[PDB]
């Protein structure tokens, strides 16, 4: 496989890890759920619901590369899984893969029976202007078919993040959340769009809502860290990153995946003049930082 499965895989033992993964999306954490879906993928790689679930989980878990690898499996096994195309559009946008992002948005739209006949229609992003135009036009055409479709607006928000048209992006993502205000991904998307469009305060209000809805949303925690750091609110940035770190490990390859976050943390500890805390980051134990930054629930 092309996916770096965790070696010491306790869910490889269990009876129904697919059921347990779905359960753990609601009742536990992303990391544990991804480990359970990893088990199913390993034992039964023809199950594209397993790959799909692994991929979706990993993106929320701040692991787009692993999300893409998983989602490409799901894509092969079921070229018509709408949600797989959507997640690929999002992760490829994050990864600055413009051709793949536009291909995934086009696939997203045309895999839907309600929009599939757009595939046969005759219809500033200068690095792929026809690919871009085609997607933009297809999504507009879909909006005329379906004007208050929340996911069309969200998908235009993605398209518009890819081309740095953050105002249009925000306006579409805003409408999306107005339609679906309990959707935590939509709030995050609106937040990320606002932050990158240099509106960090509004962004932080959007992120807060998203985390309220889904308190294990590690990507949101990271994003908040980023905005707080950007506004030079290092106490708040540091708290968010300890939470993210804590959630992201619920061990082995997973230990390694947290290292870049730890280094980002180390910078916040440096800038705030805490060389004593900086020294402690090299051990990679959260406990000292849970105490230091007021997250004492993590000591239970």
């Amino acid at each position: 496989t092309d996916y770096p499965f965790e070696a010491n895989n306790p869910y490889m033992y269990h009876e129904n890890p697919m059921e347990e993964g779905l359960s753990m999306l609601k009742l536990a954490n992303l990391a544990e759920a991804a480990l359970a879906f990893e088990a199913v993928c390993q034992a039964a790689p023809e199950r594209e619901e397993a790959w799909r679930s692994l991929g979706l989980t990993q993106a929320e878990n701040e692991k787009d590369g692993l999300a893409i690898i998983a989602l490409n499996h799901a894509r092969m096994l079921d070229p018509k899984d709408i949600a797989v195309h959507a997640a690929l559009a999002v992760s490829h946008t994050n990864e600055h893969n413009a051709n793949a992002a536009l291909a995934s948005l086009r696939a997203w739209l045309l895999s839907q029976p309600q929009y599939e006949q757009l595939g046969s229609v005759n219809l500033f992003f200068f690095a792929a202007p026809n690919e871009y135009r085609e997607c933009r036009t297809l999504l507009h055409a879909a909006l005329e078919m379906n004007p208050n479709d929340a996911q069309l607006h969200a998908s235009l928000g993605v398209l518009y993040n890819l081309s740095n048209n953050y105002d249009s992006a925000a306006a579409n993502l805003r409408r999306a959340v107005e339609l679906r205000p309990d959707d935590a991904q939509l709030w995050n998307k609106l937040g990320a769009t606002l932050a990158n469009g240099n509106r960090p305060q509004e962004a932080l209000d959007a992120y807060n809502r998203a985390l309220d809805i889904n308190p294990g949303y590690v990507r949101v925690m990271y994003n908040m860290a980023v905005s707080y750091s950007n506004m030079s609110q290092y106490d708040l940035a540091a708290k968010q990153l300890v939470r993210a770190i804590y959630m992201q490990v619920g061990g082995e390859a997973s230990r390694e995946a947290t290292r870049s976050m730890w280094d980002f943390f180390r910078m916040l500890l440096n800038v705030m003049n805490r060389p004593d805390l900086v020294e402690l980051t090299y051990a990679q134990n959260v406990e000292p930082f849970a105490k230091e930054f007021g997250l004492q629930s993590m000591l239970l």
Binding site: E62, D64, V90, T93, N94, V158, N161, N188, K189, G191, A192, T193, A195, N196, A203, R219, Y222, N223, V226, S227, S229, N230, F264
Partner: peptide, 5 residues
């Protein structure tokens, strides 16, 4: 650092 969708 970029925000992630």
């Amino acid at each position: 650092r970029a925000a992630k969708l």
